Amino acid sequence: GIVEQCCTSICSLYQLENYCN
Amino acid sequence: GIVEQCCTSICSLYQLENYCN
Amino acid sequence: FVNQHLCGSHLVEALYLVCGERGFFYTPK
Amino acid sequence: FVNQHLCGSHLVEALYLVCGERGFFYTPK
Alpha helices in C1-29 (DSSP H): 9-19
Distance CA C3, CA B13 (A): 7
Q: Which residues of C13-25 are buried (b: 16+ CB within 10 A; e: fewer)?
A: bbbbebbeeebbb
Partner residues linked to A20 by β-bridges = D24
CA distances (Å), origin C15, targets A12, A13, B13, C9, C20: 23, 22, 9, 10, 8
Number of C-alpha atoms within 13 angstroms, CB side, residue D26?
A: 32
How near does any CA of chain C get to the CA of D28, in Å? Answer: 6
In a mutational test of the C interface, the residue from B4, B5, B9, B11 whose CB has the highest number of chain C CBs within 10 Å is B11
